[PDB]
Amino acid sequence: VYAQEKQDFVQHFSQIVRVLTEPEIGDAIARLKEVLEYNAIGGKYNRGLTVVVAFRELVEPRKQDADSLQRAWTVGWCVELLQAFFLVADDIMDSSLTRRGQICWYQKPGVGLDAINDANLLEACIYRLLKLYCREQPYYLNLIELFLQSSYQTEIGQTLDLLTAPQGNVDLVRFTEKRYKSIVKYKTAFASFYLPIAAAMYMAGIDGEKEHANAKKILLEMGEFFQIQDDYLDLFGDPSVTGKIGTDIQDNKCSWLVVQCLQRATPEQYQILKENYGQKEAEKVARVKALYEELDLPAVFLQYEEDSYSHIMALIEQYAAPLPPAVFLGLARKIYKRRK
Amino acid sequence: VYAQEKQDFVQHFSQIVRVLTEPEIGDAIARLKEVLEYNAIGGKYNRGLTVVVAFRELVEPRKQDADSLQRAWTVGWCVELLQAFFLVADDIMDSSLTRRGQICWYQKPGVGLDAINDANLLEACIYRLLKLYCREQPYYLNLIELFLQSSYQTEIGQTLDLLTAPQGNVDLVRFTEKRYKSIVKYKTAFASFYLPIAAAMYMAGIDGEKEHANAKKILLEMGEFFQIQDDYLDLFGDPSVTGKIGTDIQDNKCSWLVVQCLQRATPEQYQILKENYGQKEAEKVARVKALYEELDLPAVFLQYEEDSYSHIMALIEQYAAPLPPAVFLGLARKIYKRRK
Ligand SMILES: O=P(O)(O)C(O)(Cc1cccnc1)P(=O)(O)O
Ligand SMILES: O=P(O)(O)C(O)(Cc1cccnc1)P(=O)(O)O
Ligand SMILES: C=C(C)CCOP(=O)(O)OP(=O)(O)O
Ligand SMILES: C=C(C)CCOP(=O)(O)OP(=O)(O)O
Ligand SMILES: [Mg+2]
Numbered sequence A, B: 001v002y003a004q005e006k007q008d009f010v011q012h013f014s015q016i017v018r019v020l021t022e023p024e025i026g027d028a029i030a031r032l033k034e035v036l037e038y039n040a041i042g043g044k045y046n047r048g049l050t051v052v053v054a055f056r057e058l059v060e061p062r063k064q065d066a067d068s069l070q071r072a073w074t075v076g077w078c079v080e081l082l083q084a085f086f087l088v089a090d091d092i093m094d095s096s097l098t099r100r101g102q103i104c105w106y107q108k109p110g111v112g113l114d115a116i117n118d119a120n121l122l123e124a125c126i127y128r129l130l131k132l133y134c135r136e137q138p139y140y141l142n143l144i145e146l147f148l149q150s151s152y153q154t155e156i157g158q159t160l161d162l163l164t165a166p167q168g169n170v171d172l173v174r175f176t177e178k179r180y181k182s183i184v185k186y187k188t189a190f191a192s193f194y195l196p197i198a199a200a201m202y203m204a205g206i207d208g209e210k211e212h213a214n215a216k217k218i219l220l221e222m223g224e225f226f227q228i229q230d231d232y233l234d235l236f237g238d239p240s241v242t243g244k245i246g247t248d249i250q251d252n253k254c255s256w257l258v259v260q261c262l263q264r265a266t267p268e269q270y271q272i273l274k275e276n277y278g279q280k281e282a283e284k285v286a287r288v289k290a291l292y293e294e295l296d297l298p299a300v301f302l303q304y305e306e307d308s309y310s311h312i313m314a315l316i317e318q319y320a321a322p323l324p325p326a327v328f329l330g331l332a333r334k335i336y337k338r339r340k
C-alpha cells in the first residue's frame, strides 16, 4: 500500500528524464541524463511522495483528472530534484564518501568538481518541469516562489552549518541548543517538510497565509526532529541501511550529539571532546564515539524521539484544522522510529 | 559620460547589499554581505549598465519615474549577481588563481569549497531582489523565467565546456569550429548579451516573440565574439588589465585559439600540440604559446575581430528595427577592440 505508492511514483521517473532530455548540445543532454539517473534515484522518495499523497488528500476526487495527477507527481519529482541538487553540493562540502548506497557523485573518477555544475543543472530542471506542466495553472507563480524561497532558506542554513564547523578550528563554545535549532530550521526543516505539503496546498488552491502558517508550525518542528535523527544516524546508524558514511565528528559539525555531549560532560570529558573533535584521525573519532556512549547519548536520543513525537502530535491536534489530520499523520508515521 | 554612468550604477551597490542583508542567522547574513562585497564588485559592470542604458533608451522619459529607474538598476544588479554566481563556481571548476585583480574567492584561506554554497546564495539574491522590487509589475514572471532560462542555458554550455575539456585526456579531435560555436552560444552568449537587453525590453513592455528573436540574432553573435576575445585574452592578454591568470591550455579547453591552431597546423605542429596541450607543466604551456605565435594566431585574431565587428554591424542594420540602433551600438562600442 505504502510501498505500492512508492513504486507508482518511481515508475514516473522514466517520463521525467525523457521530457528533460529531449546538435553538438546532445553530449550535454546525455550528461544531464547521467546526472539525473545517478543522483535523483536511490533515496526513500518521502518528499516527492508527500506531494502526491497530500494532493490526493486535499483535492476532491472528481477534480483529480489525468492531467491534474500528472502535475502532482511532476511537482513531487521537482521536490526530489531540489533534494538531489543540495545533496550533490553538500557531499562535496562535507567531504563525504558514499550516498544512497553508492560512491558520492563528485567522488566518481572523471566527475570531481564538475559536480558543482551538475548540481546547478539539477536545480535548473525544477523550473523546466514547472514551466512544462504548470505554466497555465493559477498556482504557477506560487510554486516558482515557493521553490526559490525554499532554496534560499536551505542555502542560508548551509551557510550557518559551514560557519559553525570550521576546519582546523575548535568551535565547542558555538555548539549551543539555540545555534543548533537555527541551523536545522533553515538547512532542513523548510525544504524537506514545509515545501512538499505547501506545494500540494497551492495546487489544491489553498493559498491562504494563515493556513500556510499553521502547516508551517507542525512541519518546521517535524523537520527539526528529522535533522536530529539524521545527526544520530551519522554516527550510530547502520551504513548498509542509511546508505552513507558519517563525517560529522571529522567535519567539526554542530551535530545534535555534540550539543547533548556538552550539556552532560564533566570538565574532564569536555577536555577529551576538545582534543578529539573536528579532526581526521580515526582514533580521535573513536574517542568521541566512546565519550557519547559513556554519557548514554543513544538512550538520550530514544527519550528525545518519544518526547518529540508526542509534541508533534500535540501540534497536529492544535494546527491541522481545517486540513485532514492524515496529511500530517502519514508523514509523521513515515519518519518516526526511522533508522534510514 | 560612460564612466559617469558606471559610477552612478556602482553607487547603487550599497543599497543592494543593505536590502539583501537586513537572531543566530545574523552570522549567515554577515557571510552573505562578505560574499556580495567580494564577488559582485571589481568587474567592468557592462551587463548591469546595459540594463540601465537600454531601459532609458527604450522607455519614454515621462514614464521614467524614481521607482521605475530604481527597478532598472536593481535588475541591472540582478544580471551582475547572475554573472558573479557563475564566476565563483567557474573559478573552482577551472582551477583558476585570480579574478578581478584579486585571489579567487575559493582560493581564500578559510573559504575553499564552501564557495559552492556562497555561489548558490548569489543566485538566490537575484530572485530576492526581483520579488522585493518587481513583484507587482506586469513583467515580473517574464523576468523570473528569463533569469531562470538564462541560467539553464549557461549551465548546459558549462557542461559542454567541461565535457570537451577532460583532465588527463587528449581531446584534439573534438576541438572543431562547430563544437566551439555550440559551447560559447550556451555558456556565454545567452546570459552575457541576450539577458541584459531582453530584461530591459520586458521592463519597457516589449514582450513580443519576433522582437525578442531579432534582438537575439544580434546579441548571440555579439556573445560569440566576446567569448572569442575572452579566449584570446586568456593567453595573450595582460593580467594587470584582465585581472585574471589564464588556464585554458592547462585545462585542455576547446579555446578559439586551439581551434584556429588545428586548422593551420602541419602534421609536425599537430604532434607538438598533442604532446603539450592540457597539462600543468609550465614548459608544455610555453611550447603551445610558441606554436600559436609561430602560426600568427594574434594576427588571425585581429583580422577575425575586424570581420566580426562588420558582421555584427550588418546584423544591427538588418534586425535593430523598431528598437533604437544605439541600444546595440553602445554595447558593441564597449566590447570591440577591448583588452580587458
Ligand atoms: O545527508 P546528510 O549529508 O547527512 C545531510 O543531512 C544533508 C543535508 C544537506 C543540505 C541540507 N540539509 C541536509 P547534512 O546536513 O550534511 O548532515
Ligand atoms: O572569466 P573566464 O574564467 O575566462 C570565463 O569566461 C568565465 C565564464 C564562466 C561561465 C560562463 N561563461 C564564461 P571561461 O568560460 O571559463 O573562459
Ligand atoms: C535533509 C536531510 C536531513 C538529508 C537527507 O534526506 P533523506 O534522509 O530524506 O534522504 P533521501 O531519502 O532523499 O535519500
Ligand atoms: C562570460 C564571460 C566571457 C566571462 C567574463 O565576463 P566579463 O569579461 O564581462 O567580466 P566582468 O567585467 O564581469 O568582470
Ligand atoms: Mg552532509
Ligand SMILES: [Mg+2]
Binding pocket: A090, A094, A161
Ligand atoms: Mg552538510
Ligand SMILES: [Mg+2]
Binding pocket: A230, A231, A234
Ligand atoms: Mg547528516
Ligand SMILES: [Mg+2]
Binding pocket: B090, B091, B094, B096
Ligand atoms: Mg574560467
Ligand SMILES: [Mg+2]
Binding pocket: B090, B094, B161
Ligand atoms: Mg570556464
Ligand SMILES: [Mg+2]
Binding pocket: B230, B231, B234
Ligand atoms: Mg576565459
